[PDB]
Design a binder for this molecule. Structure first.
Ligand SMILES: NC(=O)c1ccc[n+]([C@@H]2O[C@H](COP(=O)([O-])OP(=O)(O)OC[C@H]3O[C@@H](n4cnc5c(N)ncnc54)[C@H](O)[C@@H]3O)[C@@H](O)[C@H]2O)c1
Ligand SMILES: NC(=O)c1ccc[n+]([C@@H]2O[C@H](COP(=O)([O-])OP(=O)(O)OC[C@H]3O[C@@H](n4cnc5c(N)ncnc54)[C@H](O)[C@@H]3O)[C@@H](O)[C@H]2O)c1
Lengths: 333, 333
């Protein structure tokens, strides 16, 4: 019950258009939490942005005390509590086309630095624009004034996907599926881990492996399914996976705002420093986490097998290489 | 506790894309009400829908007992409880040249017969495809077996537009504006009426006219803005209302399902037949509504000044005008 300043960058893009509404409804921070919405995008997008601004008013949301559009970072980053960084230039290729979209990192240095300057030192930063993990890390080195801990990336999307896959298989509901784990990079190397998942079956919560009875599946194509998903959806829709990614973002923040449910944990890419898994420190890696008062704690002491350890080694090495790679991009060593 | 079939035409378009997450949520028909979501589009859009079906799974929406995508309307219209008719051509600039999007009228006529043939005679038809009013008349006309009372078109984007203009102005919240009335055509000739509205100030609930203290504003530039809004968004985004229009369908549909709150009346485009307000009969005109048991009632005994008559007459003439055009097109070749 008192205005909170929320910034959504990339605000003229596709995910933002689906996301804004939901922030507005009070689906994220409280039916009791009034928001001040800050909208940021690129100059040439400022006409569309006003359009999108008109539309948030026309929704006539009571929570929304104010709404702002901007091209300028002072306004954008001034006094925030929450920053959601969706902004970035569209992810693809490598050689099949766009060689190496790493210059999206020149953008988060610029954002971390702005966060550094104007934002409230308690600002929670959530990085959605890809490559999520490495822009977020990058954004954290530029924001030395803001804590390591309140920088996170999005993996929830992959985490929700995994759950939907499981449900499909067993013919239950995605709400019947606890403790899925997404490990590592939001990428082609993500490790959807169900060695620790549960599923309501009967009046029993059995256990993902127990339940599926088909191990090879959970260790292959299951993993593939979840990785392919973003492309598949774009394959069909021909557009951004907006409704589902906006939902995942909502969850990502809503879970930081209210905490995780009892007995359960969620995936969030955070800073590895002090990890108990054997994952290099000073990486922006995704882990099983629990959250109390806007504070995450890596779940610890989970049995980690052979398959899992390898998979977790592979995703680390890639994150590691993207870090080495962003660092000559970036303006300091 | 038993599913209803809800139809959403133009299910592979822009407003449908913003609306579907909110039907699926329980936030339109209730948290304890399952839907069998029927989706309709044109043959060439089926791959898109497949795509959208994909995101719907990823969105964990248990209320959705089923999701039917079709291009057959012996399929799409069959056994309906609610039909939501978005599907059609959207206005594009040179929306400010000529708007005889007549492109559209055949689709409503044909969809009404379909409704006649296949939907439950209790179906409640919600028409969104523009021109809202006139499409709604064409549809009801072709659906004799369905009680004309069952048809209403969308003017709640307008209603909320005006509420929104009041709020900015007074600096209250949307929730703080009440009993607004949108009269006539979903057009630049609509009338955002505030003679019967009430605002909630810290000291007391007052007339808008009284809180504002600027008649010229309300009789002039308040008016102008709400009637040119739709066109102002298209100029901005290069697309027409989606976020805001979706949000408003929800509202419209919700008041119907659970009734309007007491002391509160909403705008809805219902059949003219029998107004206590001087409006000609046999028109699809926006009036002030009360809803109890999914049945709307016009608000009567509201004194109409001259200024207000004027505005109401201006709009019933464009409605008429428009009717002439439609029914000439339909019986022409
Ligand atoms: N982490 C995940 O789960 C996940 C999933 C899907 C997409 N994403 C990523 O989220 C981001 C958004 O995707 P989209 O579909 O919304 O893209 P989009 O192309 O529709 O919109 C992106 C917007 O960013 C803007 N932009 C560019 N540079 C900017 C800057 N410096 N500041 C602010 N805005 C700026 C563009 O002008 C555009 O308006 C992309 O990085 C996308 O690949 C991540
Ligand atoms: N009255 C209002 O408040 C309001 C506000 C905004 C838009 N609209 C109108 O709503 C309609 C939707 O526009 P838009 O921006 O959502 O989407 P859009 O134009 O991007 O897509 C709408 C979809 O309708 C489909 N369609 C066309 N003919 C069809 C048919 N015969 N059967 C089924 N589907 C069919 C198209 O294939 C398209 O996928 C337009 O008429 C627009 O002008 C009304």
């Amino acid at each position: 019950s008192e205005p909170i300043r929320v910034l959504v960058t990339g605000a003229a893009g596709q995910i933002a258009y689906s996301l804004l509404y939901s922030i507005g409804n009070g689906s994220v921070f409280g039916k009791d939490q009034p928001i001040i919405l800050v909208l940021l995008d690129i100059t040439p997008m400022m006409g569309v942005l006003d359009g999108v601004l008109m539309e948030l008013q026309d929704c006539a949301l009571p929570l929304l005390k104010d709404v702002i559009a901007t091209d300028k970072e002072e306004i954008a980053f001034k006094d925030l509590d929450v920053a959601i960084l969706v902004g970035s230039m569209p992810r693809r290729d490598g050689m099949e086309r766009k060689d190496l979209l790493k210059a999206n990192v020149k953008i988060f240095k610029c954002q971390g630095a702005a966060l550094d300057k104007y934002a409230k030192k308690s600002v929670k930063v959530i990085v959605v624009g890809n490559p999520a993990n490495t822009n977020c890390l990058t954004a954290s080195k530029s924001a030395p004034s803001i804590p390591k801990e309140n920088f996170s990336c999005l993996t929830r999307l992959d985490h929700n996907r995994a759950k939907a896959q499981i449900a499909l298989k067993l013919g239950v509901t995605s709400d019947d599926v606890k403790n899925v784990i997404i490990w590592g990079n939001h990428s082609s190397t993500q490790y959807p881990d169900v060695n620790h998942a549960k599923v309501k079956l009967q009046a029993k919560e059995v256990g993902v492996y127990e339940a599926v009875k088909d191990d090879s599946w959970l260790k292959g194509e299951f993993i593939t399914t979840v990785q392919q998903r973003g492309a598949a959806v774009i394959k069909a829709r021909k557009l951004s996976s907006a409704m589902s990614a906006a939902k995942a973002i909502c969850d990502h923040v809503r879970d930081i705002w209210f905490g995780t449910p009892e007995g359960e944990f969620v995936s969030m890419g955070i800073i590895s420093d002090g990890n108990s898994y054997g994952v290099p420190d000073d990486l922006l890696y995704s882990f099983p986490v629990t959250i109390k008062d806007k504070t995450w704690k890596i779940v610890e002491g989970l049995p980690i097998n052979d398959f899992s350890r390898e998979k977790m080694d592979l995703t680390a090495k890639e994150l590691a290489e993207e870090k080495e790679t962003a660092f000559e991009f970036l303006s300091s060593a």
